[PDB]
Amino acid sequence: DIVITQDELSNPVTSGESVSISCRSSRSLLYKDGRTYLNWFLQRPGQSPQLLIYLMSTRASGVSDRFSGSGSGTDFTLEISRVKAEDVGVYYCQQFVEYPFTFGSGTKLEIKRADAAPTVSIFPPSSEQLTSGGASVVCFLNNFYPKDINVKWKIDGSERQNGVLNSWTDQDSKDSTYSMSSTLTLTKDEYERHNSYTCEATHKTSTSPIVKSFNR
Amino acid sequence: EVKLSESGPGLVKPSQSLSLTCTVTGYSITTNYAWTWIRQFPGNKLEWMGYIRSSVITRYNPSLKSRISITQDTSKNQFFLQLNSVTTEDTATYYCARYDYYGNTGDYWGQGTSVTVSSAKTTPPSVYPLAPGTAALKSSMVTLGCLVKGYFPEPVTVTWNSGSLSSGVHTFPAVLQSDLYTLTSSVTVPSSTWPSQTVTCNVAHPASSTKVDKKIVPR
Ligand SMILES: COC(=O)[C@H]1[C@@H](OP(=O)(O)c2ccccc2)C[C@@H]2CC[C@H]1N2C
């Protein structure tokens, strides 16, 4: 089957600038009718794929004129003029000349916005979970940039590394920021054996970690 | 206009058969369009599975061999996907879409439905409220949340105030552990509106037919 390869972007791009995304096919997509059957799709965070371009250079209905496509028979390029926060996600090209109609590996687009420190919030276990014998302490590190970040848990002033699970969101389509949740899970008895619970966020935006805590 | 919607079991045991339905509204499927099924594996790789067109024309991905079948019911304006002898390799999000001769699908894609191939049993989540411990600088913003713990399979649908509040919401990707998923969702609102204005997280788990509404109250 036809194999379509795509290379990753080397860095996040600046809003307003022009960006080019490439796609390469192992076989020509030029059909006997002189048309080249290559589609470009954008899959925004948490959404279904949306067609941007078809027939290599034809814009789909309602697609912004900031998107244009060019290329030869095996090398294609999607050009995005004046890139916007809403353009983040993964771009995929697809061929429509031979079964199966394969998709490329996809290219992620990130926006490099101004540095932003995270808004940190910590939450004690709920009375409901406690009656269940469990105790989860949750910490949210919201709306920061860049994406690199480190969270440290402390219990009664002592560092903790066991029972912690983190999750990161993709880049926000509206404000180009990132968010993370850190959850420390312990048995009820363990939780009842300490008083101070602290979440410590270290970001590039500052020398000192942002600290949030509570006393049981 | 045209709208497509997928539906079917989100959990299928290995070796058994997967079945999905795409209900089309606003356009007849007896038309000359490729009513197709596409799937996206964990990792985001996309794959064309095949299509049914003009009622009697079907085309399938050769790699699926003879285990895939695509059929339709004109009276209900629905087309179906049947994938036999599934393995964990078939775990993915399945989408239906309308493709025309020139490869154009417009915005005619369904929202997709997740199917997980596993021997594990369906387990409903327990939903816990996340309310601040003490008080902070008011007159600004306050963050609340909900912890959705111990469910299987994915996904869970989390909304705040019935979905009437969607701005400033962060629902994090679930983490898997011991065949169970756990996820959290945060919501940030003007401190002047909480706890005066109620804030509730709604958590639905389709696979287990459960739904929990948890109001966040001060502690
Ligand atoms: C392998 O065949 C192709 O690539 C064909 C076609 O696929 P199809 O005949 O299966 C079809 C799809 C959707 C709607 C009508 C017809 C798509 C375009 C047009 C001709 C040819 N391809 C370049």
The B residues from 78 to 137 touching A (CB cutoff 8 Å) are: 95, 99, 102-107, 109-112, 126, 128-134
Q: Do B103 and A168 touch (CB under 8 A)?
A: no
A191 touches B at CB < 8 Å = no
Q: Do B103 and A1 touch (CB under 8 A)?
A: no
Q: Do B219 and A123 touch (CB under 8 A)?
A: no
Q: Do B102 and A96 touch (CB under 8 A)?
A: yes
B62 touches A at CB < 8 Å = yes
Residue type present at position B84: N
How is domain B1-119 classified at the CATH fold level?
Answer: Immunoglobulin-like (2.60.40)
Instruction: Give the experimental resolution in Å.
Output: 1.9
Q: CA dist A78 to A52, A57, A129, B44, B141, Å? A: 9, 9, 50, 20, 40
Lay out the sheet containing A67-71: strands in order across.
Answer: A4-5, A19-25, A75-80, A67-71
Residue A191 burial (CB < 10 Å; 0-12/13-18/19+)? Answer: buried
d(CA B99, ligand 1 centre) in Å: 10
Q: Do B106 and A101 touch (CB under 8 A)?
A: no
Instruction: Residue B48: list chain A partners with CB under 8 A.
Output: 94, 99-103
Cβ atoms of A92 and A50 within 8 Å: the answer is no
Cβ atoms of B34 and B56 within 8 Å: the answer is no
Q: Which residue do the tokens 């970001």 mark? A: A203
Cβ atoms of A75 and A63 within 8 Å: the answer is no
Distance in Å, alpha carbon of A38 to nearest chain B alpha carbon: 8
Q: CA dist B156 to A30, A45, B62, B146, B150, Å? A: 43, 17, 33, 12, 11
- Write down all domains in chain A, each with its CATH number in brackets: 1-113 (2.60.40.10), 114-216 (2.60.40.10)
CATH 2.60.40.10 intervals, chain B:
1-119, 120-219
Q: Are strands B113-117 and B92-99 parallel, antiparallel or unpaired?
A: antiparallel
B155 touches A at CB < 8 Å = no
Pocket test of ligand 1: the residue of A25, A56, A96 to mutate, having most ligand atoms within 8 Å of its CB, is A96
Nearest CA to ligand 1 atom 12: B101
Provide the sign of the torsion angle of the four alpha carbons B104, A92, A58, A84, taken in this order.
positive
Pocket test of ligand 1: the residue of A25, A37, A98 to mutate, having most ligand atoms within 8 Å of its CB, is A37
Residue type present at position A193: R
Q: Taking the domain B120-219, which CATH number applies?
A: 2.60.40.10
Q: Give B119-124 contacts, CB < 8 A, sequence gap 24+.
A: B119/B13, B119/B14, B120/B152, B120/B153, B120/B179, B121/B152, B122/B11, B122/B152, B122/B153, B122/B207, B122/B208, B123/B150, B123/B151, B123/B152, B123/B180, B123/B208, B124/B151, B124/B205, B124/B208, B124/B210
